[PDB]
């Protein structure tokens, strides 16, 4: 189950990122 | 063989066993022994009841339950985040309902139909067996295939109740309990015609003779040969074939 | 009490915390919404498919009721007297279920 | 029960903190 | 398997083997080399197994 949860990390980087750059 | 009748003309499969004791004719009907079963007696529709639920009554305490606490939060910022904590609790309802089922219909998909005679060779609880001292018996015993000598080896272990004495007692024993027989595939023909109750499971096994049956050593028998030639040559033989398997 | 190693939704739990309160003190907002939305449909569909998962493999294996079911069955050991009775019939048994079962 | 009786008993839960909440 | 069915699965000739593969849904089993032989002609079946 911690397959998902590397790729879930990633994109909560991912959309913590986004955040940080649209704003 | 004790020449207290001269012909036989009943029914009997043409086997080694008794080419060697008494004579036949050529065989004026060809033969298979096949697997008589009930029909599966299952599936249930939705005419009064349809199966929504799994734990039905404890989903009605379920839908009870939120109907309440919807009235709650009709009647009391924290709002939004209650309403969404039920929402995922209704998502975790419906992933549950979800899962439950799919583990019902895939346990339902994987099923065995026991179509070859294999199928009921493997298993117990379905029992089998055929008519008592008839041609079935005999070639069960003589068969060195290890899947018709495991089924000859059940009959036989359990022989007190298995081995009934005539067809009529065959349909007796279809119809109750959980039984299929193994027998010959034209009075198969005759009671799925006569009753659409029944299914023949799996084809022919092996392929037998209906002839006559005459005392060893004639030219009776030689001339019953002949005239049995003759008289499919007359095709009387395929209108008498008509006028009684069918109905 | 998943078949699943736990704490990875205690880090849900956590993230999604820590994405709305920063989300609090702040085109974007429709387009974390859907983000968020879409992750969260990617979690309950992992946790959906886990649970069918382990009930499926648990309505696999039904319970014992007949010998032949207990023949199939692998995990459930088995045994009786041995040298005496209700072994050497199962010494000499052709049928498969008792067969396999003297396997 | 089982699975049902932790719904109902998180579901409780989920009752007394929004009552906790909403005072 | 083949010994129950041995009057209706079982062929007469290479020729009836090589037809039901290409017909109905049927694995043959035989030497290697005529297999060999079939897939360097044919390119609609294949070898199975060592």
Known sequence: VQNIGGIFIVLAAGLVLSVFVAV | ?247
Chains 1, 4 share one sequence.
């Open chain 2, 1 to 247: 063989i004790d020449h207290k009748a001269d012909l036989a003309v009943a029914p009997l499969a043409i086997t080694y066993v008794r080419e060697k004791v008494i004579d036949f004719s050529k065989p004026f009907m060809t033969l298979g022994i096949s697997i008589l079963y009930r029909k599966p007696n299952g599936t249930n529709p939705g005419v009064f009841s349809f199966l929504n639920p799994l734990s039905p009554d404890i989903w009605m305490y379920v839908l009870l339950a939120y109907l309440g606490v919807s009235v709650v939060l009709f009647v009391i910022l924290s709002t939004r985040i209650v309403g969404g904590i039920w929402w995922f609790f209704t998502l975790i309802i419906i992933s549950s309902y979800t899962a439950n089922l799919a583990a019902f219909l895939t346990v339902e998909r994987m099923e065995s139909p026991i179509d070859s005679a294999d199928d009921l060779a493997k298993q117990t609880k379905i029992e089998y067996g055929a008519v008592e001292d008839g041609a079935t018996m005999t070639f069960f015993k003589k068969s060195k295939i290890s899947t018709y000598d495991k089924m000859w080896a059940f009959m036989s272990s359990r022989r007190q109740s298995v081995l009934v004495k005539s067809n009529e007692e065959g349909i007796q024993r279809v119809l109750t309990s959980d039984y299929a027989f193994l027998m010959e595939s034209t009075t198969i023909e005759f009671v799925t015609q006569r009753n659409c109750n029944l299914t023949q499971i799996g084809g022919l096994i092996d392929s037998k003779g209906y002839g006559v049956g005459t005392p060893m050593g004639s030219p009776y028998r030689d001339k019953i040969t002949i005239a049995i030639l003759q008289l499919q040559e007359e095709g009387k033989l395929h209108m008498m074939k008509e006028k009684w398997w069918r109905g």
